[PDB]
Design a protein around this ligand. Sequence first.
Ligand SMILES: N=C1[C@H](C(=O)O)N=CN1[C@@H]1O[C@H](COP(=O)(O)O)[C@@H](O)[C@H]1O
Ligand SMILES: N=C1[C@H](C(=O)O)N=CN1[C@@H]1O[C@H](COP(=O)(O)O)[C@@H](O)[C@H]1O
Ligand SMILES: N=C1[C@H](C(=O)O)N=CN1[C@@H]1O[C@H](COP(=O)(O)O)[C@@H](O)[C@H]1O
Ligand SMILES: N=C1[C@H](C(=O)O)N=CN1[C@@H]1O[C@H](COP(=O)(O)O)[C@@H](O)[C@H]1O
Lengths: 159, 161, 159, 161, 159, 161, 159, 161
Amino acid sequence: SAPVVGIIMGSQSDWETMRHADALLTELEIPHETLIVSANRTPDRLADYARTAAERGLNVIIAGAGGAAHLPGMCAAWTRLPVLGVPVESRALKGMDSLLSIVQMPGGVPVGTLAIGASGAKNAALLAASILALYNPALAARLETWRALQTASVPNSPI
Amino acid sequence: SAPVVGIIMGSQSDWETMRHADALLTELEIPHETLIVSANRTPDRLADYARTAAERGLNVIIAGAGGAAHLPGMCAAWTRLPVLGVPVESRALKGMDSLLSIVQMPGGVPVGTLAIGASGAKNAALLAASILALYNPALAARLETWRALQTASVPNSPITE
Amino acid sequence: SAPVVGIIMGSQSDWETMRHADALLTELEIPHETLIVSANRTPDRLADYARTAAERGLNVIIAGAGGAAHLPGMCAAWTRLPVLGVPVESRALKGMDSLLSIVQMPGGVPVGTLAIGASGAKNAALLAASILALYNPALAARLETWRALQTASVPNSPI
Amino acid sequence: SAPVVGIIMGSQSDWETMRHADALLTELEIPHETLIVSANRTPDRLADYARTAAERGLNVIIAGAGGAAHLPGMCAAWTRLPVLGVPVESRALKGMDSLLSIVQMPGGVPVGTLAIGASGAKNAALLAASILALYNPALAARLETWRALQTASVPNSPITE
Amino acid sequence: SAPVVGIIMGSQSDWETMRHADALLTELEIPHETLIVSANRTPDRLADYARTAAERGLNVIIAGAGGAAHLPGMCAAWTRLPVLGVPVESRALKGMDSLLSIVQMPGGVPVGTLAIGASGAKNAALLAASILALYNPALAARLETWRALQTASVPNSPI
Amino acid sequence: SAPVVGIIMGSQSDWETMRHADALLTELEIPHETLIVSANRTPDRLADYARTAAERGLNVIIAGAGGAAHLPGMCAAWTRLPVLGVPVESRALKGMDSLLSIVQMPGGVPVGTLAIGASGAKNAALLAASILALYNPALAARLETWRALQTASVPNSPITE
Amino acid sequence: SAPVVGIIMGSQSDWETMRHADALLTELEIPHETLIVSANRTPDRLADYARTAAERGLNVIIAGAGGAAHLPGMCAAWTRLPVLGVPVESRALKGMDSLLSIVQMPGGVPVGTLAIGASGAKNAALLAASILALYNPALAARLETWRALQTASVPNSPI
Amino acid sequence: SAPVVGIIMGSQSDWETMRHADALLTELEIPHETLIVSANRTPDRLADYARTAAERGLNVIIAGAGGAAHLPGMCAAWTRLPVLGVPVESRALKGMDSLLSIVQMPGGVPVGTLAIGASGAKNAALLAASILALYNPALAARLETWRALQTASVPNSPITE
Ligand SMILES: N=C1[C@H](C(=O)O)N=CN1[C@@H]1O[C@H](COP(=O)(O)O)[C@@H](O)[C@H]1O
Ligand SMILES: N=C1[C@H](C(=O)O)N=CN1[C@@H]1O[C@H](COP(=O)(O)O)[C@@H](O)[C@H]1O
Ligand SMILES: N=C1[C@H](C(=O)O)N=CN1[C@@H]1O[C@H](COP(=O)(O)O)[C@@H](O)[C@H]1O
Ligand SMILES: N=C1[C@H](C(=O)O)N=CN1[C@@H]1O[C@H](COP(=O)(O)O)[C@@H](O)[C@H]1O
């Protein structure tokens, strides 16, 4: 019942994108928390959140942000847990700024980066699930089922 | 000594980049295998590798590729295991083609992507380590020590040649 | 009556773009099939489709996909037939990601790439027709007529 | 020994790239001609070449060009034959100007575009081969053998210098 | 009364952009013609148009096109007259493809390139006017007046 | 021998690029002046130059600049004469910053932009020549001869080292 | 009561973006002026404005423009005062052209550049405030309060 | 001799770029400190530095970083002082990743960004100088003299090797 995955995002504006990560984890019955945390506007909140993640029982953190998107990398800077990053698409640069600021992390501080937008958010949840599946047979089976349903449900011809 | 991490790359040319992932895993004492598999040139070899990864005991796959990089994504298409992708720097487009071909995976088939080049390879290994550390106390301690040393090793002031 | 060209696309989302390829082939009376095939979501479906293409009588394959667009290159990886690729334009990167993932194929596995979007889809069909025309006089004549009508129909002044 | 494939390029500078297309066709025993034709600098030469390609027996045209690359597109404008385009890498923009100028053809005038550089030239020849193989059993067998050898020749593990 | 400037565009689709060039020339009372000419769809029409431009009395040609935009450069390839190019903005790449295909012309075949879109079209007309002004005092004066009105009409504060 | 074309550049560093414009004008026998003027570093020098260009007899101004290239645009802001701009290649961004800073002029202040680098400088001179040729029969003939020679000088087949 | 910060923009079109800078300065009670000044259309107006800035008592200038955006750099070329630049997002290149034309200034003529768009405009005002705060305790306190309210007001969870 | 400007950089590798900022401040006689602080690798070190900057007497912070450059932005997150950012050129992406990671700060946390590379470092120091000059007549005169000399030092015509 206690969250094993933490979904954090730069602002309310990111919810439209990050909700796909939330929905996916719920579907796979993965206990998690969903919060707003800004690296630049709430730096101490991030430090505390990331520092204590492991102690609170979290195993994976999904972080999403737009623009310069410092959130994912800074979260990874304070936690030893795997951090997955979702570039949130934005008006001007369509998430290209977010993508580079997240994926180009220096050696030593990784952020497993997913695609820009909703699909990236969804995949961050699926990637987190695949990580948890390594030591949770029940979840692993549910993940196998989800993947199998995806493959089997793709139509053979367009409508 | 059974491998828990599989490092695959599209070619020998990618090794200069992927060797950094191999070195880091060895440093952290994580048993792994290193192979060359091309999605575009040896698709059946990739299919066989990816389909049997889980049953062979692998827990994480690190895939490196450049250009129209399809290796990580296709590997992820055949395995339920987490797949981490490393964009190998390309000559003309400096790895931008590699990056987009890897990171822009459709919803439903994830590939955790790392930085272009050596730094990415190193982080892919560190990310796989943090994944394995979730259920390996010994490795977790080793990872912690490694991270802590990195931070304490950063100089405080610049050296003027 | 048996299809000599196969139009495959990553998902239903690509139909809005790939229908232009379909329409063009029908106009030129080129027998063909139109299907949904995902390299990442239905890898085995793609392997089987591409592997058996030649045996089924297909001469050219038109493949369209958005995002990382692995479909065209992976199809070419399994078939000896000419594979033409159409980058499908997408929200964030406007098909630039799709273009690079398709056109930058390594030496040994070609994908004749067309423009991003509807025009690329239309041109993939026209390119496939020009290939088939090399050994089909009737089609070659119809293609000559289509090209001639295009050139002759361009207005001399804007409205 | 009549040519069935025509390899045209904008300049001598493009030859370093296009020679790879020439070499591959020769390897597959495909009769072809190799010429220098510039759309921007020798437009009338291009018009003559493209208009007569079909009547001269050519079946596929491989065109290489860099910068504001118009050679492939204009060639396609005058011939009904399939035209394959090879973006030659440019100094400043690393071939991005070459790529967009070639691949972004308007609906109605196709140009099958290949990768930037040598790899593109090689694939343009392989693509032309696969086109010709549709109605040439002998070439088809040769192409098949070539592809099969490429796949079997890929190493299984990396060499550590 | 005979046109001294020719405005040519790739297709009707470009009119929304190229009309700004047309409007500007009319405002400055510069005799001109406005036509649709496609380098790729009507190659012979372009060759003939460009080849005969000088003989017909044209002094400057404004050419606009989107996508690969071969029109401006190919026009310059056949005429000795100054050719000005306008990259027409397009759906996918926002005219970046058009810009590079026009501005990156090789040494020996120039195309004076203007900004992407309506402003570029307007400026192509103004640039053509500044060229004609060099040997037409009446026009030069009207151009001076237009430039003076532009500068004087800029508000001092936003509304 | 009064100059009719003015070639200005932001710095000595830009000369390697702009010398190509100077050489071409001299070749076509077009009297011109070549100076260094920076919009960002010598704005008043630019203002004086641009305001008096027309009264000094100049007919066309060729301006070269790199980086946040403002020289061509600001020159155009002060003169009614046609201003041609040459984007000088930049180190990091390979001239893309130079290109956009020059070509994206607001409606009302034109700058005819040429290719990044040497080719652009050469074309700026050729464009200025074609402008001057409109009312100079002698130059027109020289320009025609120059163009015709360029086309006839293009090789027909590639040289294989 | 006399303005200590000058907000200048390329045209009325930029107001939608630059108003955020205006609003921010008013909120922090920083006396300022808001004007339209075009480097390319009103060069002499800019020269005079920038040259006299210091004499008029201005301490910081915020300049915003789209497209080639010469305004910020040219303003900095004529004044010794700190000049902050805001790339205004535009149709075609989404402000990437504006960003490079502003940030890539040569050594010797700086322009502190902010993000593309509304956020950049807002931040230019905040940066100007932080500069003024260095020698105005009352403003410094109000700035501390504004920053504190920003941090404290960020929600803990998305709605 | 108390420092009023703080120059921080992510690594020793960034020094080649940031030394230009150090040199300019020293030239203008502006007391400053130069340190190495990484946002991604020494976050706690950055937090301590940024939080105490104001109380330690610093007035302006110049931060240089490359790649996923977070140093300037995070420093700005903890201090009310103006923070100027210098994008350090990166190998593959030539500093574009550095630039976007720095300049695209969210509304509410400003970072005045300068050009990619050395020029940016130099301008960051000049910008900090102009800020300090607002309330330092002596420095203002020195800055004025410096600017005036730069303008008068620009050559009027190019040197032909
Ligand atoms: N860049 C940040 C910073 C961070 O945590 O890195 N705080 C949030 N952002 C991003 O700022 C962007 C716009 O936020 P806004 O609508 O609150 O102004 C969002 O994409 C958010 O993720
Ligand atoms: N990238 C792929 C993968 C493939 O086959 O390569 N499967 C399909 N896609 C692309 O994913 C994009 C979005 O698909 P969606 O609306 O089903 O989430 C489409 O452009 C589709 O072509
Ligand atoms: N690229 C060309 C080619 C040329 O003349 O270069 N013919 C026209 N185009 C461009 O094709 C684009 C789309 O045209 P369309 O709406 O007729 O399909 C237009 O921007 C037009 O300028
Ligand atoms: N590029 C300039 C020039 C300048 O001052 O640098 N004058 C104004 N602009 C920009 O031109 C763009 C479009 O202006 P417009 O709507 O008046 O045509 C605006 O973003 C404006 O900032």
